[PDB]
Amino acid sequence: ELIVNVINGPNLGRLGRGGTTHDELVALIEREAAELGLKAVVRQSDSEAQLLDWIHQAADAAEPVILNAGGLTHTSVALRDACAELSAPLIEVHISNVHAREEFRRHSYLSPIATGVIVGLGIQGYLLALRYLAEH
Amino acid sequence: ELIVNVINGPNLGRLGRGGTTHDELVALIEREAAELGLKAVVRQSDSEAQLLDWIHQAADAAEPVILNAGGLTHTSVALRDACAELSAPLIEVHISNVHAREEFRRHSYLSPIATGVIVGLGIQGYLLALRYLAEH
Amino acid sequence: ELIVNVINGPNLGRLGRGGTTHDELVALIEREAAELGLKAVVRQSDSEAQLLDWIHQAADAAEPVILNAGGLTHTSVALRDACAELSAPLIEVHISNVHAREEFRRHSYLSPIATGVIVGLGIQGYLLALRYLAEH
Ligand SMILES: O=C(O)[C@@]1(O)C[C@@H](O)[C@H](O)C(OCc2ccc3sccc3c2)=C1Cc1ccc2sccc2c1
Numbered sequence A, B, C: 001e002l003i004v005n006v007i008n009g010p011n012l013g014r015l016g017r018g019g020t021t022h023d024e025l026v027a028l029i030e031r032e033a034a035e036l037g038l039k040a041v042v043r044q045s046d047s048e049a050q051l052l053d054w055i056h057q058a059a060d061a062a063e064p065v066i067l068n069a070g071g072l073t074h075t076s077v078a079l080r081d082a083c084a085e086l087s088a089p090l091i092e093v094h095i096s097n098v099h100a101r102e103e104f105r106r107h108s109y110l111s112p113i114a115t116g117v118i119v120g121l122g123i124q125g126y127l128l129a130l131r132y133l134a135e136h
């Protein structure tokens, strides 16, 4: 019921140097989860292996995942395969509109196995993902 | 003569949750190697860097490798380049038939430099790889 | 003014087993930097995450980077995105002529955001990169 895992991939630690930092993002997400009667567990890593371990744990616990894989979105089959194990919903979030930039950003290995996908609505995208999981 | 390195990539630790676990696989491989008069050293990691170090060691020791790179099979040039250094045979194994699934799984950076490749014969594929190395 | 970061990616630790080793390369680069009135800080890792941290530090310090990403050159969007943060020049170096080999080596995620690119001039490529940064 309560626990939602928010997982951020490579370079998302560099947020705010917008002016919103990753710590600020964690704080916004936590607050919104509280207002929605959820607990958000937010994690970020530049390491593919660390991201896979976190997905493994969400699979074993049957908890939902909101995932912004950063660059790995367009490149990693390993991450996609880890996510394919999830039984609870997977929501893909991108801060920027990945369809308005380079062609390589318009393909995601994650989109076809995600429940849904939100892009280009900024940091609010994460909050809106939270809200979707709350009404489901 | 005796030593064969079996290297498993990302997500192969999730075997059995088939019902064959990775530990079970290690056990099957070891037994078969013993019956063939070989020693199997089996290793698994979700970390590309760890996989590359293991390939580096096989190159320096001039020992054979049976490799199931998981997702990295379709994506990693770095791993392919590490494997290109091997002087002893490289056998590529996939549990599933990667040619019966998504198009992206039908390209391997490893196949063109491998001695040969076995797919879709399940866990027995590893054992059959062992047997090939024993008669060569 | 003085500091230039030279960053080597996966498999570059295997140099010399040419006969030039990575340690030898570090030594050549340092000497040339000294003769040019610079300091070269040379680093190598098989770990994408480690490479990204080093790029993050160059971005925060506003220092230049000479980067040979190895295999990650052709595959990593995450590394490209990290490098896009650099305000000082980025020079891409490849020891081999990547345009004379397999087709996959003829695409780089880094070239379009690099100041310039040197390939196929061997280890001297790094020294020539140093010299460019010295006259700019
Ligand atoms: O959510 C995304 O828009 C995306 O997933 C798009 C994806 O295609 C891309 O790989 C990505 O990482 C981009 C990125 C990551 C780090 C940096 S630092 C300066 C620019 C920059 C850009 C990201 C993550 C991202 C987005 C905006 C920002 S601003 C500082 C970092 C960062 C990361």
Ligand SMILES: O=C(O)[C@@]1(O)C[C@@H](O)[C@H](O)C(OCc2ccc3sccc3c2)=C1Cc1ccc2sccc2c1
Binding pocket: A077, A078, A081, A082, A084, A085, B010, B011, B012, B014, B015, B016, B018, B068, B069, B070, B071, B072, B073, B093, B094, B095, B096, B097, B098, B105
């Ligand atoms: O040997 C393969 O068939 C392959 O190399 C194919 C390759 O295209 C793929 O990246 C891969 O990793 C797939 C994978 C890895 C982990 C998991 S967990 C639930 C599904 C799943 C799937 C694998 C490894 C693989 C195969 C079957 C199974 S079952 C649980 C994990 C796993 C991993």
Ligand SMILES: O=C(O)[C@@]1(O)C[C@@H](O)[C@H](O)C(OCc2ccc3sccc3c2)=C1Cc1ccc2sccc2c1
Binding pocket: B077, B078, B081, B082, B084, B085, C010, C011, C012, C014, C015, C016, C018, C068, C069, C070, C071, C072, C073, C093, C094, C095, C096, C097, C098, C105
């Ligand atoms: O600078 C390059 O030419 C390149 O960036 C080209 C790039 O397309 C490739 O991924 C790469 O890594 C290649 C590589 C890396 C390690 C090894 S060990 C035996 C062969 C080999 C080849 C490299 C790095 C490279 C180049 C030459 C040598 S010789 C031993 C390692 C190595 C690495």
